[PDB]
Amino acid sequence: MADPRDKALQDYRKKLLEHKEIDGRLKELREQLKELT
Amino acid sequence: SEVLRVTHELQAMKDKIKENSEKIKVNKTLPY
Amino acid sequence: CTKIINADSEDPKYIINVKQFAKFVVDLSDQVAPTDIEEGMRVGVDRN
Amino acid sequence: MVLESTMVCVDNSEYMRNGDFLPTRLQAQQDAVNIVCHSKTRSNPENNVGLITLANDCEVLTTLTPDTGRILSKLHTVQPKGKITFCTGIRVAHLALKHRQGKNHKMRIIAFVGSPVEDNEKDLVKLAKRLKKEKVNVDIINFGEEEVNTEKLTAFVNTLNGKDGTGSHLVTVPPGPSLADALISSPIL
């Protein structure tokens, strides 16, 4: 309760950034292995 | 997970396609 | 004997017209430097 | 260094879809893998690995190989649908092991007995009575479903030993969905 949803918001943003990195990896590889195949 | 199926699982074209191009190249005999 | 109708620059491949037989694409033997061989000169292509 | 090959009986039963150790159970059979043998080659780079399913009379998805990409790739598609099979499942692995190269390698079967089996009482006659003369090793992993302690399955190692054997052990990790550290640390192997 001490944090005014600022540090928690930053941590959630970092988690979303990791999720976005995973999504970008998926998007890149789904086409890279497609091209290799 | 997703990557392990792609890091070396799949992505094998970097080895098979490499080899396959090797034989197509090797058969590029000098005369034409 | 055979003439050379082109010498692909930066690409060791050459194109020659022997005389009456046919044309071909030839590689330059190691014994002869590419500079010594030009366009239009007569080359000593070997059999086989 | 390693006087052994490796074949695994990765369960595929219809019951395998369950939350008992993690996400959907099998999601954990896959879990050790990346260590289910990743540790085994964490040994001299001459170990051998395998894979065998156990549903619908069971097929074979990997032939003994000092490679892991194939085993992981097949593991990705192990959809659970069907009644578990045994005895026959173990004999298929036994034959496959016999067809192993580098005779110096000893045998090892890690049995991920998950869903319940239908084996009768005196299955020992074929389950274990051979491994001695065949000098085989079998390991049992009980993916929960430990019905009345599954003394039926425990009797397999019981038939093992007779003086010395059991392989590592017939470890039945508790139904507590802790993790695979129980299949990572517990296995001194």
From Swiss-Prot, chain B:
Processing after translation: Sumoylated by UBE2I in response to MEKK1-mediated stimuli.
Subcellular location: Cytoplasm; Nucleus
Domain of life: Eukaryota
Family: Belongs to the AAA ATPase family.
Quaternary organization: Component of the 19S proteasome regulatory particle complex. The 26S proteasome consists of a 20S core particle (CP) and two 19S regulatory subunits (RP). The regulatory particle is made of a lid composed of 9 subunits, a base containing 6 ATPases including PSMC3 and few additional components. Interacts with PAAF1.
Primary role: Component of the 26S proteasome, a multiprotein complex involved in the ATP-dependent degradation of ubiquitinated proteins. This complex plays a key role in the maintenance of protein homeostasis by removing misfolded or damaged proteins, which could impair cellular functions, and by removing proteins whose functions are no longer required. Therefore, the proteasome participates in numerous cellular processes, including cell cycle progression, apoptosis, or DNA damage repair.
Known disease link: Deafness, cataract, impaired intellectual development, and polyneuropathy: An autosomal recessive disease characterized by early onset of deafness, cataract, severe developmental delay, and severely impaired intellectual development. Patients later develop polyneuropathy of the lower extremities, associated with depigmentation of the hair in that area.
Protein name listed in UniProt: 26S proteasome regulatory subunit 6A
Organism of origin: Homo sapiens
From Swiss-Prot, chain C:
Gene symbol of the encoding locus: PSMC2
Protein role: Component of the 26S proteasome, a multiprotein complex involved in the ATP-dependent degradation of ubiquitinated proteins. This complex plays a key role in the maintenance of protein homeostasis by removing misfolded or damaged proteins, which could impair cellular functions, and by removing proteins whose functions are no longer required. Therefore, the proteasome participates in numerous cellular processes, including cell cycle progression, apoptosis, or DNA damage repair.
Entire-sequence positions represented here: 98 to 145 of 433
Quaternary organization: Component of the 19S proteasome regulatory particle complex. The 26S proteasome consists of a 20S core particle (CP) and two 19S regulatory subunits (RP). The regulatory particle is made of a lid composed of 9 subunits, a base containing 6 ATPases including PSMC2 and few additional components. Interacts with NDC80/HEC; this interaction is detected only during M phase. Interacts and SQSTM1. Interacts with PAAF1. Directly interacts with TRIM5. (Microbial infection) Interacts with HIV-1 Tat.
Compartments reported by the entry: Cytoplasm
Induction record: Expression is not cell cycle-dependent and occurs throughout the cell cycle.
Posttranslational modification: Monoubiquitinated by RNF181.
Biological classification of the source: Eukaryota, Metazoa, Chordata, Craniata, Vertebrata
Name the UniProt record assigns to this protein: 26S proteasome regulatory subunit 7
Similarity comment: Belongs to the AAA ATPase family.
Domain of life: Eukaryota
From Swiss-Prot, chain D:
Domain VWFA: start-end pairs: 5-188
Keyword Transferase: no
Keywords: Isopeptide bond, Phosphoprotein, Proteasome, Repeat, Ubl conjugation
GO cellular component: a single term: proteasome accessory complex
Gene Ontology biological process terms in this record: proteasome-mediated ubiquitin-dependent protein catabolic process
Cross-link (Glycyl lysine isopeptide (Lys-Gly) (interchain with G-Cter in SUMO2)): 122
One GO MF term attached to the UniProt entry: RNA binding
Chloroplast is among the record's keywords: no
Entry domain remark: The 2 UIM motifs are involved in the binding to a multi-ubiquitin chain in a cooperative way.
Family: Belongs to the proteasome subunit S5A family.
Subunit structure: Component of the 19S proteasome regulatory particle complex. The 26S proteasome consists of a 20S core particle (CP) and two 19S regulatory subunits (RP). The regulatory particle is made of a lid composed of 9 subunits, a base containing 6 ATPases and few additional components including PSMD4. Interacts with NUB1. Interacts with SQSTM1. Interacts with UBQLN4. Interacts with UBE3A. Interacts with UBQLN1 (via ubiquitin-like domain). Interacts with DDI2.
Function: Component of the 26S proteasome, a multiprotein complex involved in the ATP-dependent degradation of ubiquitinated proteins. This complex plays a key role in the maintenance of protein homeostasis by removing misfolded or damaged proteins, which could impair cellular functions, and by removing proteins whose functions are no longer required. Therefore, the proteasome participates in numerous cellular processes, including cell cycle progression, apoptosis, or DNA damage repair.
Protein name, UniProt field: 26S proteasome non-ATPase regulatory subunit 4
Organism: Homo sapiens
Gene: PSMD4
